Amino acid sequence: REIHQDWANREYIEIITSSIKKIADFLNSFDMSCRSRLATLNEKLTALERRIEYIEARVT
């Protein structure tokens, strides 16, 4: 009866929504990790730029 099909459809929608929220959570986590390692790379680059400034000032 229509109620049975209704239960089936609601279960379908529930599965799809769960998948969508999994995708969103992955997006958030990936963004956080990328921020962290970008900060690290930037710091490393900054440490290197200052060092080359100092060296080339010492050699001239």
């Binding site: 710091e43 490393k44 900054t46 440490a47 200052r50 060092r51 100092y54 000032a57 010492r58």
Partner: protein, 78 residues
């Protein structure tokens, strides 16, 4: 600068303070990426762009103006 406003006998207090600063740099380096202590020290001593630094310049100034004309040597105690 605190060395530069004192006699020659304060070189010991100077290197003591420099060692304290080096230990501080070593401790803070565990978490932060700072310039090497040598680079910082040379920048502070004006010894990057020039041959001699402030410490040696003040050592010579002190020699000339206060050490040669004011001190008495003792051979036995050295």
């Amino acid at each position: 600068g605190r060395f530069e406003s004192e006699d020659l006998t304060s070189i010991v207090e100077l290197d003591g303070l420099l060692e304290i600063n080096r230990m501080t740099h070593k401790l803070l380096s565990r978490y932060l990426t700072l310039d090497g202590f040598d680079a910082m020290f040379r920048e502070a001593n004006h010894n990057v762009s020039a041959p001699y630094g402030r410490i040696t310049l003040h050592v010579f100034w002190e020699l000339n103006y206060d050490f040669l004309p004011n001190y008495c040597y003792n051979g036995s105690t050295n």
